[PDB]
């Protein structure tokens, strides 16, 4: 087909090896604390802390992918000059070969023209607040080779990206540039160099921006960005580089850039290497950065090999061998590097996400740490111990968790100055319950059974232990009923789309309440919580009974109950009369029954399964939309308008594992696996190494193409559908349930698994070819009835060995 | 090629000639409204809107950038596969076979161009009271062989009105349009799936907005609505896909960028020309059937369109035409200062290349300034004007620091109040706002004689209502509820420096001249009121108020810059820095404060220590090391903006004053140094249009001495305006007549004026034979030798020939 790459499981990278690919292909470098987004191009920007107020690369979203770090490389002897990636320069591919590796926060970019061979490794060091881009030159021809290799990069006005790109009558003027022999500083607001130290002028002081070259002296350099580039001239040939000399002038007002020149004499065979480094630091800082990289070979080898020893070795805390190679590639490596940024970066930045951001969504921020838990428990405690802090003290959660949260002193939405600060009206229905899936997993992975009595404080007012923070969720579900006893809908749930009323009743949310209750009923029960537990019985009857009275339809449960008493999600609805999530958590939260549960799955197959995943719901909003159905605004087949959204591919994907129906949750995987549709690139156009947050459904004349890649809900469901799920991973308190589903196909698989301090190497055998099963299982050599391994059994090196068939 | 680098003016259409496509910068021009409002520069980049620059916003485009995209029209020939764009840019052809010429005019832009023996003229403008745009192309075949040629517009649409919706909620509005083709046109449809809502209904306070392309004169031959489908993958505008292989996609946008792009197919015989039209705009398919038909046979309505704009402009411009030895003098006053006069009358600071963000309201002392650059050609323009500012005052007297759109005079809220400050973001009111006010009404009612405008009862912002006379009055008030530690009036929030925090206790200098001229306007306005009693307060505070400014605020030769509600002296002639400021000097001799051989003085020192080849510097030194705590302008890089910037708009107030004083010699190199015109030479040193004015010029403190920045809109226009009308050619009238005391370069032996005033055609004749700067030596009204330099109004008739002999 018209393949732009493929993956490398041996180096755990993605390799590009045609590079107009139909999107930019992105990758992340280092952390939100000085993080760096690069295409497969050479195109983003950089930032500290806050993408769009921190940002230090300028970048022009939703255009060309430019501008980017850019190195270009100039013959001396023909004159002739290239760009070390593909573009800006754009040669030919018949005469200009080139090869981009995404990797664990780091990109390569090989490229080969004129026998001159050059690899760009472009990462963030660990623990650094700064950028490298190494270049290594190679001489491939028999002749002696007179090189001028030019970095360039673009630098903003201002950190804030509304002063740099709409206050131009007040960033226009603010800036200069200085050069200092091996490096150009950007001075923003130069002038107030001469304030005492620690004060201010306007709240604004001297902030310092840099770009140097470390490894080969300097032999031009260029601040103004029209200097470099010329007047009419594109980053595809600046005059700097066409002229094969810089203008060695800096800016004063306008746009500053970082241009450095140097020039290499290159014998047959012979190779250097050369770093530019960028970042915000003050001088000497970037003058210990610089000296550090004077001879960067071993320098830079050793960092890359810290940052691989780092992300790798959080990866091989689960690895799993099975017969498909799409299945092996997304657990092993890129499904667990998404959870890994979605858990870290949350939605700071991306390509599509370039605004401001007040904080932490919650139920965002509680369900990607399921993502993780499994990989970096220690992680995932901190974040849950932050985010139950986040829970005010009426049991809901913060809808926006501040980045200066301070337990105990925080305002609420039923704070005007709350809502005035965060832009969250209300409190919504579905938050914390996101806390008891989340928690459990936490507790199940760890054996923390200790965590369940650590105090914690709420947000505005008092304490709790943890398992007080859950018993004060579910009575924040119970004191918002609505009319059918079932829980009101506040503000909204998950689908932000969908506004049934704050007196509506969502089956969504009233599906996550059982669900809880049944989390919090273990948790009872370890504490010896007998009043509480039979509480919690009668309650979850009564939940049980009036979800099955009210929501349970024709072989599918009901979307909810507006506030003006219409039902939403009836078969017999001209639109919109068959949702996914209701089915998908009617299984998980085991309201349903085993034949209810086989029906509804069925009738999700039937009506919402297509070749690139499961709609939303169906028919499409258009013609017959409600007071609150939000999402006709969108076009159909897209975003919550009946589009494939991605992070409910995990819940169906998950509850058909619940199921034991391996066939039918492997065949949704594959149809969401973005390495599953590497061959159909030009459909999907998304990275095929990442999740997006929604794919076209099939109501859109462009179904199967994804959108906003990386930062999405995406990866943590899928990760627990295929961890939880399809492989059986199921631990609880006191040990660990093995209940795999998978396609019957797989003669025998192998997984890898650190679980409480002990390596367990788990063969999983299926020679009757079954879906699931537990015909037999051996622990360290000795039979062990049923599918549960006690955490008594586990040894520092366990051997498994389930015979499901 | 310095004389002439990238263009001339063409005086006799009023249009400058853009002769060389790669000019320093993207010179634009203004086409419409603010009511549909389109910017276009010499490569025809740019964008259109609808009420809002940035919440209207109907065309995409990336500012501080490559002037992209724009209003491109590509040429191609089917017989050998090239083509070319009908501005030099975006295909960029090289100049040795590609000629073209940019003319910008009132309210239009005609671009034309040659290549391959081919002739492109397109025509950009709105109809007068129209909302929409036209692109007339006309293509002359001057080969003698039939040519097959593929036509292309191009129109790149926005996904959302709001700027920030479009730029930055990608989530969001990427999902949200579609394109549609209607056989002549293409509609881009924004929320395109609520067209099937309930009558009147909306969802999430949205409804399907749409907006449309389309073609006239010639049948659409392929479209495409899709923009990555038009350039294709790694594509620039300098070469689409969908030009590149002479048809479009026919392809519609669902998702993602739309656009607008509609081949169209011409067999032209040798000689033979044809017209079509491109429309672009805002509204509803069934008006657009409308609009397209009206184009369908485009060349006499399109002339007669173009006529009529044409018409209007230049008949207001007709009102007030010079004759004299400067060129750059007549071609500034004649037309473009004229026309930039009325560009910041009606479009305020509404949108530019620079100003792409949001806006409320007006500024007070902005709009109320701008008002008297068009006193002499638009008077009623001028007094409605009036009225709206006079009805945004408060009931203290102050002005509202921003006046609302949604202005409702006797229901609106004040500084004073929180809902005010949370919607306007203006937290306390500005200590001159008000006093604009009396040079500019005084200016309009000299000029027009509409005494019963005095009468005029105008109600205020918040409560009450008053004649215009006691609005003045209540004006005073203010200034005088408000005083300082000195006896003069606080500093408030500000005064017209947005970068000099003295505090609310503090006192601003600029201030308290503004407010003895202001006292001086009000006494003429009690004269003629008989308001007895309140002459002698005036004439009181007055003297006082002269008093307290000479006893404070005179230093080495020059006035302060004011006081600090700490006690310090800004502006102290032995400060280390910003020692020396050129307003307080200016508005000494303006409001009169000065004497005449002290306004010599401050005039002298400011011409040693501020001026430069491109103007006087807003103070010197610069703030760098020695800046207190309200020195904001330090902030800025030194020479730029107003840390001792050349700013533009300060100098017509020290050319006027000059010219007050009779400096002819010196208010015509005042002139000389800032006019865009006689910088036309130096254009590369200028980069800013040198046919409109800027906000600032780079002071001498700078490496890039003499680089203009901010073009069109802003408050230079209308200060230099006065500056050359009622201060060099001294066209100075009052309530009963009009003065001519012109103060002109020595050089000059007779110069001619056309003015209307008072219904009156003037033809004035000043004759300098002695080569002086000013003086009075005879006056000739009507074959009749009149005493002085004073022409009564019962001396005017319907041609009035004046002859003045100034030696
Ligand atoms: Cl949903
Ligand atoms: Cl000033």
Known sequence: ??????????????????????????????????????????????????????????????????????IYIRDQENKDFW??????????????????????????????????????????????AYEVWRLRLTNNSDRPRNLCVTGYAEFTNNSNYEQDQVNLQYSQFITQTAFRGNRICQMIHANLDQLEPGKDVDDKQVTERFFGLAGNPVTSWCGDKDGFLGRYHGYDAPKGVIEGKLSCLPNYNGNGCGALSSDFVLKPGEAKEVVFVLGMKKDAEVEEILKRYEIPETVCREEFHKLVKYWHGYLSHFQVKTPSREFNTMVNTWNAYNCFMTFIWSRAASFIYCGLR???????????????????????????????????????????????????????????????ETGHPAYRADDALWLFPTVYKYIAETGNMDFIDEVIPFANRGKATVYEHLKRAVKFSMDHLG??????????DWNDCLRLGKDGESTFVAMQFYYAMTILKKFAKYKKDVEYMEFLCERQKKLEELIQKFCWDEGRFIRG????????????????????????????????????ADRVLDVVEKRLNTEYGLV???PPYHAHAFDGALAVIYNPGTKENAGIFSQSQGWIILAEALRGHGERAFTYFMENAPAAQNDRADIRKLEPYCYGQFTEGKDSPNFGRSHVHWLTGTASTIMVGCVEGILGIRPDFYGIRLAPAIPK????????????????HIKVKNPGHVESGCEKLVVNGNVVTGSYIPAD???????????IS
């Open 616 to 618: 939303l719901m169906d």
């Open 483 to 492: 009319r059918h006893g079932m829980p009101a809908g506040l503000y909204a």
């Open 793 to 803: 059994l586990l040894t520092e090196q366990t051997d498994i060995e389930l015979f």
């Open 358 to 420: 007040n904080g932490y969504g919650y139920r965002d921020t509680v369900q990607d740490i399921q993502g993780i838990i499994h990989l970096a428990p220690d992680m995932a405690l901190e974040k849950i111990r932050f985010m139950l802090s986040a829970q005010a003290d009426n049991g809901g959660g913060l809808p926006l968790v501040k980045f200066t949260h301070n337990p105990g002193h925080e305002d609420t939405p039923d704070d005007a100055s709350y809502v005035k």
């Open 745 to 760: 196909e797989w003669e025998e698989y192998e997984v890898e698994k650190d679980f409480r301090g002990c390596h367990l």
């Open 83 to 128: 760009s070390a990636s593909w573009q800006p320069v754009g040669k030919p591919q018949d005469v200009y070969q080139c090869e981009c590796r995404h990797g664990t926060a780091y990109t390569n970019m090989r490229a080969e023209y004129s026998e001159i061979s050059s690899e760009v490794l472009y990462y963030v060091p660990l623990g650094a």
């Open 561 to 596: 109950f507006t506030e003006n008493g219409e039902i939403i999600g009836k078969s017999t609805d001209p639109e919109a009369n068959m949702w996914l999530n209701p089915q998908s958590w009617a299984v998980i939260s085991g309201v349903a029954n085993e034949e209810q």
């Open 1 to 70: 087909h018209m393949k732009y790459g493929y993956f490398d499981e041996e180096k755990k990278e993605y390799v590009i090896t045609r590079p107009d690919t139909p999107a930019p292909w992105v990758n992340y470098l280092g952390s939100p604390e000085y993080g760096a987004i690069i295409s497969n191009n050479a195109g983003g920007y950089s930032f500290e802390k806050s993408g769009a107020n921190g940002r230090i690369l300028r970048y022009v979203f939703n255009n060309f992918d430019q501008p980017g770090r850019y």
